[PDB]
Amino acid sequence: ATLATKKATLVAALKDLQRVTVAFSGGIDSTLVLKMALDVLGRDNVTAVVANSELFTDEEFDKAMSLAEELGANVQGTTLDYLSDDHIKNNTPDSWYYAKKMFYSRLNDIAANNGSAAVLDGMIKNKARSEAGARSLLQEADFFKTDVRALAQELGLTNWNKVASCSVSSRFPYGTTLTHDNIAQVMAAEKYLRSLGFPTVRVRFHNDIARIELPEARIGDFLVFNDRVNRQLQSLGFRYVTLDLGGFRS
Amino acid sequence: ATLATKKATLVAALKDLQRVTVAFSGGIDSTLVLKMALDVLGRDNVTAVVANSELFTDEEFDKAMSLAEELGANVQGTTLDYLSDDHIKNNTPDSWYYAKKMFYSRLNDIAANNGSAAVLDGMIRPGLKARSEAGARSLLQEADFFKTDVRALAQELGLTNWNKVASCSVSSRFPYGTTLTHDNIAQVMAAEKYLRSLGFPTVRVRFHNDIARIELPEARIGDFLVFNDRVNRQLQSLGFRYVTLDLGGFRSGRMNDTLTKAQLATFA
Amino acid sequence: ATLATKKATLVAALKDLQRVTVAFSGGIDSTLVLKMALDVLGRDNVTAVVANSELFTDEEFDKAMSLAEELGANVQGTTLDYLSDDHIKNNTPDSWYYAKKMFYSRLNDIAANNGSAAVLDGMIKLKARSEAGARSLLQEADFFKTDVRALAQELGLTNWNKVASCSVSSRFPYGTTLTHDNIAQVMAAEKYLRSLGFPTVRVRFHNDIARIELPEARIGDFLVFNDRVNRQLQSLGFRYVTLDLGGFR
Amino acid sequence: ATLATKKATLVAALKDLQRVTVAFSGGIDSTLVLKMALDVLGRDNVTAVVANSELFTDEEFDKAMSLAEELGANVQGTTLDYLSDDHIKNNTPDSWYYAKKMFYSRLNDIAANNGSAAVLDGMIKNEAGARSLLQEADFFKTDVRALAQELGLTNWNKVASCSVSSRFPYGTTLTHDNIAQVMAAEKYLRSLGFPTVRVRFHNDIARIELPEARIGDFLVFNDRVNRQLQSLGFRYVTLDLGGFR
Amino acid sequence: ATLATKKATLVAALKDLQRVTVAFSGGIDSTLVLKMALDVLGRDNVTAVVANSELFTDEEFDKAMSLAEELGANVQGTTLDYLSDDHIKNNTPDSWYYAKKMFYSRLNDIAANNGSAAVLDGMIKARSLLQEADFFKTDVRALAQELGLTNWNKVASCSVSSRFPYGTTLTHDNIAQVMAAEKYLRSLGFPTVRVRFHNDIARIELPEARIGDFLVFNDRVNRQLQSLGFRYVTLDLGGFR
Amino acid sequence: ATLATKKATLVAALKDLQRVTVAFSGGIDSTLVLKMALDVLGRDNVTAVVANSELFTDEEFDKAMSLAEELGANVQGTTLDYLSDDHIKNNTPDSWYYAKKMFYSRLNDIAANNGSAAVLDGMIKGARSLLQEADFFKTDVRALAQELGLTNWNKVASCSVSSRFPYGTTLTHDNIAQVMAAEKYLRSLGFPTVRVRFHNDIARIELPEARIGDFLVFNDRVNRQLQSLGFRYVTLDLGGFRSGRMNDTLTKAQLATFAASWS
Ligand SMILES: [Mn+2]
Ligand SMILES: [Mn+2]
């Protein structure tokens, strides 16, 4: 019920596993997992893995790989071809599942190859991981968001990814087929908009229409960029560039 | 040559044809032809026809017909079912031609029954011109009238009231290949009438299935922000899932600079 | 007097002159003069003249010429070279005087050539107008601005140029020398700004700095154009393109 | 039927009355009546009356009287004391009645004294002592405009005029000072480029109603409006988020 | 003047007091104090108290009480009835004084009851030890992070009495009405906001730099504050202050 | 390669020098250098030098000096008379060089008298830029600044007031005070990043383009205020602050041709 007992449960489970592979996103959860694993098992018994794929930006991958090295961990990139699975490529509502199944499947192959006893992720108390058998040790020790921040301060952890990102599949309607070209064009559009000073942004894909979602409090500030955004996204392949009057997550 | 002769040749053609049916749009050109026909032939010798259809607003039709009654013509309304022609219902790039063909066909059938010698229009292809195939005569075109000569002579005859903004068929708000229905046509026109009621007379609601794409003059987009939320829910209640505003505005590219206008033209 | 007497005095003056040339700007004063001339002497005895020059836009020139033709007049354009006079080219406070000297001179020559007895303008109740023998008939009949609009409504006149036009010299400080290139630079800049939906606009010239004056109530509407205006006006030759926070004048 | 029929009915009605007094506000409706009255009967059979009062602006009064002479009428101004009636000074919901009663009473006395057969006002489609010939001829807002261009009328007051009583809550007493306070505020707002505006009076709070399409253009004036209306006596100067009406 | 000398000055003062009761707001100042007392004196000698009242938001109360447990302290909520004092209920210009009188009296009682030597608060440049150690806004951030502090309440609040004119009677309903209005405005993306109460008129103060960003919310803010009971919803052209 | 190696090479270079004088601006680069020198060499082997001149605001000087002693360094102020040099006083295009030569000359003199082996500055990828020798980029500076708990630094990059005057215009106390009073007023309204370029009777305000919409509510007071400081016209540059950096690919290249038109 106290953070000390919850931290005791986490140290004991890690001592039990002896050698672990950690699915590392750069967030505060996996940062806490990978830092506790290094402290109890040592650097040669922990492998931090960062997933690289089309569905996430090449820049966020670089960020996660540096944060793992800053913790003092051996970090390893693995490249996933999500588009090879037809459920992910045709963006059915179960795409989230086959993406997560192919992710944990690759984590088990490297953990088999490195002699680890488990795959660890950063899920707390607030379907594919349990199918493959990954362990959420923070969830098993009854960590909540407050306990993660509490133990992170106890250990001196201050640096992590404060915004967590979503799969780029969210910018496509169900049934639309994802290609190498329309994924890349959606991400260039969002990287350009972020470059203008709009960190929270979405470019929803509707074939020849780009549908830009912004926080409504920023749309007044956005007017001075209308024409540059319009022609920049047309040079990326959109025929029409539009702004959704509903705002962010209409 | 000079305006006195151009009006003289126009009167000579009208005197020769003796009884005419005039395609009347409410514009200044068709207002000038029908009033000159009245002055030369008198009321029982001229029939003004105003076309009603789903492709144009109920407000334009009521207005064009009142403006013809105000000039003193015997006026007749006709309703055209443009959607019966598959070129118009499937919005082919040439559906403008098949629209005008069905229009002049109905006008010629009206002119056959009222005993007029010609159909006159207010003019200042996949085959033969819709006029030349139907027998219609553009008498201002045979008299070499220009936009100013129409305006010059329209005052000379005391003409003051006409439809000044001109219209565009509602088919222009749909992409080529999209099928026009009674429900989605009503949907765009309700959307544009609501936007107009907010104070934006020049507006377009382009139909993109579940996306509505609003074109406004870019100079009004700053003024438009206070209506964003009401516009979005109003057009969602009209059936659109997403309501969006095109960042190029109305007539994308006409108000850009030399280099960036050439870039906006290359992308099309 | 009453507006009936003032129109009676105006018709008698025109009837006596029999053949006339009218300097036509498109404004309500010259429109009322040229329509009274058409009605009293007929289209064949009245010639409307519209001045074209480097100091005024081709767009204001085109409007006056359609309007004169739309009133049922035979209208003729003339191009004036104001910059040949150095009083205009070095932009002294008497520049408008020497400009008007050259304007009425060309008008006098047209009236000799077509057999007119006087040149008429639309000035109501000045030094250069007199030395050329020009007649201001609305002023001779004691027309005021209220008499001008009153008779303009009696004649069914509804369409005229509402924006009096200013010579481009006002966009340069006193003493700055006007050239063909910097005159062309200001007018291209202003033609572009007006095309965006700002009819009331000025681009003040400060060598490499352009200073845009807009009505303060329109500055919010302008924000969406910042980037295109800035690059268009640099391609016209300005190094810096700026917006005056004081607004128009 | 057609505007020609509507104009004929109005011409025949005017010929029947022979002598008329016209209540002239300067708007397009009364401008169209007063010019038709002049056009059918001539300057000497028509009397244009312009009401001066504390409930309407001095700028509107001067404009209508100048517009009447420019239309060719003999025009005369009559002053009304709306605040002398206790129903108007205490701003009851029935204040309109006693204002209209007082207004038409004064017009009837001017028309009796000059021998006119009726008092005419500029009321259209959508008061016994006054005839509304445009409403009797079934003129609509569109038909008024239509015939106004047919006659070359271009100059009138383009924004509808409303009594200043609407800027005070029902039950508030009207004074010379608070009326002057609202009017100075609305006159200043109009000078910045907002013809349609209201300054609702709430004692120490001013509540400005603008057309919602103009509120974005208004931001550049926030600061100057806030100090001008404070020097007129408001402690708080505010902008109503509902807009005009 | 070295953050090391200032923290040493602070560590020395805490050791002298032994047992302490800390007035905890959830801000970085009171967060830096409450942890520093725990680090030098231990959990069993430090009690963090978080005040509950109608003059401050339920969210600020709930947030500070969790954030203090997250620091590893024994935390205790106390409820204050500020409206029981007639100066506070009638919102007199000196009512700020009587409000702080009830606050520090209740803390002092608590500190007497648990055997603490002083009540400490988080006031920078009762005992303000951060103020006695010459901490500045920047010295607090440097040392907080030093111990690993990242989580606190950055939006410092003010008593809701400031939204009512002097002499206006505070009720439970109009206090609830102003705070519902401000929570809605904050949720749209305007953290600094005031809804001044003028009976049937709401007068919104926003930072003038945000008024342009605010325009798109005019209509729903207008209908939202009316459904809360205002007849007129307005925006003050002078802005915040 | 790895941030640890870059911090490792940085620790090795500092250990060899033994005593250093640090040119301290208050920015993140020199703040990271000055702490790292303290951590390897101690308070008695590091002297932080902060330059005060007429060309920078009294406020950035005050902030830099508090940040140097607050990091635990013994810091000393040095005052440079940049306006005594004619290249700077007449603002020739090479003024920056003569400013930096006069700056580094005084730093060499202080390091001679306190027995330091080198003067260190904060320039990244006889002064030595240890961050540049350790292959630090903007990204490695921010990462290692977070690794050491450094939170406070001069966040809005600071620049010489000479940049607000055209080349050839002579700087005076009256026109410098005029530019800095104008810029200090704009900052108080909520625009930390701002430039008021001087053009004789014209002030030309550059703002980040993302703030220009927010600026409209201040148009008139900014106009009145800067006229009372001596400007006849107060204008807003439509290209904004650092024009071109946030435009599209074609527009950024055109504005770069326009910028290279002048020299
Ligand atoms: Mn903003
Ligand atoms: Mn506007």
Swiss-Prot record, chain A:
E.C. designation(s): 4.4.1.37
* Impact after mutating D29A: Loss of activity
Q: What happens when the gene is disrupted?
A: Deletion of this gene leads to a loss of lactate racemase activity.
Catalysed reactions, semicolon-separated: pyridinium-3,5-dicarboxylate mononucleotide + [LarE protein]-L-cysteine + ATP = [LarE protein]-dehydroalanine + pyridinium-3-carboxylate-5-thiocarboxylate mononucleotide + AMP + diphosphate + H(+); [LarE protein]-L-cysteine + pyridinium-3-carboxylate-5-thiocarboxylate mononucleotide + ATP = pyridinium-3,5-bisthiocarboxylate mononucleotide + [LarE protein]-dehydroalanine + AMP + diphosphate + H(+)
Q: Which residues carry this modification: 2,3-didehydroalanine (Cys)?
A: C166
* GO molecular function annotation: ATP binding; lyase activity; sulfurtransferase activity
Question: What InterPro entries does the entry give?
Answer: LarE, NAD/GMP_synthase, Ni-pincer_cofactor_biosynth, Rossmann-like_a/b/a_fold
Q: What induces it?
A: Induced by L-lactate and repressed by D-lactate. Is thus regulated by the L-lactate/D-lactate ratio. Makes part of the lar operon (larABCDE).
Quote the Gene3D superfamilies the UniProt record gives. Answer: HUPs
Q: Which UniProt keywords apply?
A: ATP-binding, Lyase, Nickel, Nucleotide-binding
Q: Where is the active site?
A: C166 (nucleophile and sulfur donor)
What is the enzyme's class at the highest EC level? Answer: lyase
Q: Which NCBIfam families does the record cross-reference, listed alphabetically?
A: ATP-dependent sacrificial sulfur transferase LarE (TIGR00268)
Q: Which family does it belong to?
A: Belongs to the LarE family.
Q: What does the UniProt function comment say about this protein?
A: Involved in the biosynthesis of a nickel-pincer cofactor ((SCS)Ni(II) pincer complex). Catalyzes the ATP-dependent incorporation of two sulfur atoms in pyridinium-3,5-biscarboxylic acid mononucleotide (P2CMN) to yield pyridinium-3,5-bisthiocarboxylic acid mononucleotide (P2TMN). The source of sulfur is the enzyme itself: Cys-166 of LarE is the sulfur donor, thereby being converted into dehydroalanine, and is not regenerated in vivo. Thus, two molecules of LarE undergo sacrificial sulfur transfer to create one P2TMN. Binds nickel. Is required for the activation of the lactate racemase LarA.
Q: What is this protein called?
A: Pyridinium-3,5-bisthiocarboxylic acid mononucleotide synthase
Task: Specify the taxonomic lineage.
Answer: Bacteria, Bacillati, Bacillota, Bacilli, Lactobacillales
Swiss-Prot record, chain C:
Question: What is the residue range of the signal peptide feature?
Answer: none
Q: Which GO terms describe its molecular function?
A: ATP binding; lyase activity; sulfurtransferase activity
- Inducing factors: Induced by L-lactate and repressed by D-lactate. Is thus regulated by the L-lactate/D-lactate ratio. Makes part of the lar operon (larABCDE).
Keyword ATP-binding assigned to the entry: answer is: yes
Annotated EC: 4.4.1.37
Q: Which consequence is recorded for altering C166A? A: Loss of activity
Catalytic reactions on record: pyridinium-3,5-dicarboxylate mononucleotide + [LarE protein]-L-cysteine + ATP = [LarE protein]-dehydroalanine + pyridinium-3-carboxylate-5-thiocarboxylate mononucleotide + AMP + diphosphate + H(+); [LarE protein]-L-cysteine + pyridinium-3-carboxylate-5-thiocarboxylate mononucleotide + ATP = pyridinium-3,5-bisthiocarboxylate mononucleotide + [LarE protein]-dehydroalanine + AMP + diphosphate + H(+)
Active site annotated at which positions?
A: C166 (nucleophile and sulfur donor)
Keywords of this entry: ATP-binding, Lyase, Nickel, Nucleotide-binding
Matching entries from Gene3D superfamilies are given as:
HUPs
Question: Phenotype when inactivated?
Answer: Deletion of this gene leads to a loss of lactate racemase activity.
InterPro entries recorded for this chain? LarE (IPR005232), NAD/GMP_synthase (IPR022310), Ni-pincer_cofactor_biosynth (IPR052188), Rossmann-like_a/b/a_fold (IPR014729)
**Matching Pfam families:** NAD_synthase
**Function summary:** Involved in the biosynthesis of a nickel-pincer cofactor ((SCS)Ni(II) pincer complex). Catalyzes the ATP-dependent incorporation of two sulfur atoms in pyridinium-3,5-biscarboxylic acid mononucleotide (P2CMN) to yield pyridinium-3,5-bisthiocarboxylic acid mononucleotide (P2TMN). The source of sulfur is the enzyme itself: Cys-166 of LarE is the sulfur donor, thereby being converted into dehydroalanine, and is not regenerated in vivo. Thus, two molecules of LarE undergo sacrificial sulfur transfer to create one P2TMN. Binds nickel. Is required for the activation of the lactate racemase LarA.
Its family remark reads:
Belongs to the LarE family.
Q: Which PANTHER family match?
A: EXSB FAMILY PROTEIN, NAD_GMP SYNTHASE DOMAIN-CONTAINING PROTEIN
NCBIfam families of this UniProt entry?
ATP-dependent sacrificial sulfur transferase LarE
Curated annotation (Swiss-Prot), chain D:
What Enzyme Commission number does this protein have?
4.4.1.37
* Reaction equations catalysed: pyridinium-3,5-dicarboxylate mononucleotide + [LarE protein]-L-cysteine + ATP = [LarE protein]-dehydroalanine + pyridinium-3-carboxylate-5-thiocarboxylate mononucleotide + AMP + diphosphate + H(+); [LarE protein]-L-cysteine + pyridinium-3-carboxylate-5-thiocarboxylate mononucleotide + ATP = pyridinium-3,5-bisthiocarboxylate mononucleotide + [LarE protein]-dehydroalanine + AMP + diphosphate + H(+)
Expression triggers: Induced by L-lactate and repressed by D-lactate. Is thus regulated by the L-lactate/D-lactate ratio. Makes part of the lar operon (larABCDE).
**Quick check: keyword Glycoprotein in the entry?**
no
Provide the active-site residues from the annotation: C162
Where 2,3-didehydroalanine (Cys) occurs, the residues are: C162
Upon gene disruption, the observed phenotype is:
Deletion of this gene leads to a loss of lactate racemase activity.
Query: Which superkingdom, per the lineage?
Result: Bacteria
User: What does the UniProt entry list as the effect of changing D29A?
Assistant: Loss of activity
User: Which NCBIfam families does the entry link to?
Assistant: ATP-dependent sacrificial sulfur transferase LarE (TIGR00268)
Q: What does this protein do?
A: Involved in the biosynthesis of a nickel-pincer cofactor ((SCS)Ni(II) pincer complex). Catalyzes the ATP-dependent incorporation of two sulfur atoms in pyridinium-3,5-biscarboxylic acid mononucleotide (P2CMN) to yield pyridinium-3,5-bisthiocarboxylic acid mononucleotide (P2TMN). The source of sulfur is the enzyme itself: Cys-162 of LarE is the sulfur donor, thereby being converted into dehydroalanine, and is not regenerated in vivo. Thus, two molecules of LarE undergo sacrificial sulfur transfer to create one P2TMN. Binds nickel. Is required for the activation of the lactate racemase LarA.
Q: Which PANTHER family match?
A: EXSB FAMILY PROTEIN, NAD_GMP SYNTHASE DOMAIN-CONTAINING PROTEIN
Q: What is this protein called?
A: Pyridinium-3,5-bisthiocarboxylic acid mononucleotide synthase
